[PDB]
């Protein structure tokens, strides 16, 4: 019945230190629809975050795209924190520039 979400953290364009970009967190494959998502920067929540509106796939599972404008640097750490009913504790997926 319930399906745990898949989480992907990545940038819109290949990450280059100093070039403005978009940090995305694609959360999909989940059921039911209730969910909470946060983009994090160095372990701290990012306030200027937008997201798509609740929609679902052909397999019936829901998905959302959370994003924010950002400028990658050599030191800044980025992640995505998701909280869904199928999760005993919020899950955090780190952003890997190579993923």
């Amino acid at each position: 019945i319930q399906r745990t979400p898949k989480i992907q953290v990545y940038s819109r364009h290949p990450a280059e230190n100093g070039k403005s970009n978009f940090l995305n967190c694609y959360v999909s494959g989940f059921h039911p629809s209730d969910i909470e998502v946060d983009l994090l920067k160095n372990g701290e929540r990012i306030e200027k975050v937008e997201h798509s509106d609740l929609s679902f796939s052909k397999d019936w599972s829901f998905y959302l795209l959370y994003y924010t404008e950002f400028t990658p640097t050599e030191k800044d750490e980025y992640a995505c924190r998701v909280n869904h009913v199928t999760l005993s504790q919020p899950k955090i997926v780190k952003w890997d520039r190579d993923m």
């Binding site: 319930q2 990545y10 995305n24 059921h31 629809s33 679902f56 994003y67």
Partner: protein, 269 residues
Amino acid sequence: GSHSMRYFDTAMSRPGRGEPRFISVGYVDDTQFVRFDSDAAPWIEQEGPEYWDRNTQIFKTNTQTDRESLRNLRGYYNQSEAGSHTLQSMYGCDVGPDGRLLRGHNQYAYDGKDYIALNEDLRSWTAADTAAQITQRKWEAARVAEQDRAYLEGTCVEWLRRYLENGKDTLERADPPKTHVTHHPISDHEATLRCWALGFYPAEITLTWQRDGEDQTQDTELVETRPAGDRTFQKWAAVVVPSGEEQRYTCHVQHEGLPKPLTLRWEPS
């Protein structure tokens, strides 16, 4: 040259917290063009006032029918009014390059599980369990499939052709993928090759790794196609390879927007 129009509908009860969430999202191929939401493309904006008044009216009435379904469903499964439940449906039509109907669709899911679906003959139903059989019987008596069939073969096909023409500049045009292969050593002997495809549209795409001309189908880590955030899509496939024998590996990219499938391979400056 073929296209499709599909609506994705949701009705989710929120007992003790408010009224049910109702949603309807329309797509032409992989482009969202309309969205109705109880909690709330340029070529659709040009539709007159009647188009919007009528569609809004249909959505509102549809949510009332969904309220009826949700409560009938609770009865079938003998569920209480205390838990939240979700009713979903996907419907639409597929047309060939000639704008002619290829096949219609109309299926429903209850709490994330296939419930009942209109068969390809758009004349019969396939129920998932005894509950859906109650629904099936009720709908055969009401000739619901005939009504749904009329929409799918008529209204559906007609408006898809219209949208395809009104937004042709963006619809019947596909965005080729920007590709690049990355390398990241897991150790001395084994390394990693990742084939990237970015900024493509539609989402349909094929990425395969082959060595000595043979698909490494089993040693390929392929991720789910994802949205870039700008209407385009992304996807990659990774494979592990021994240091030195990387030129023995090629990535084969197949996509509508490409004049010819690409046969890429990794690289440094």
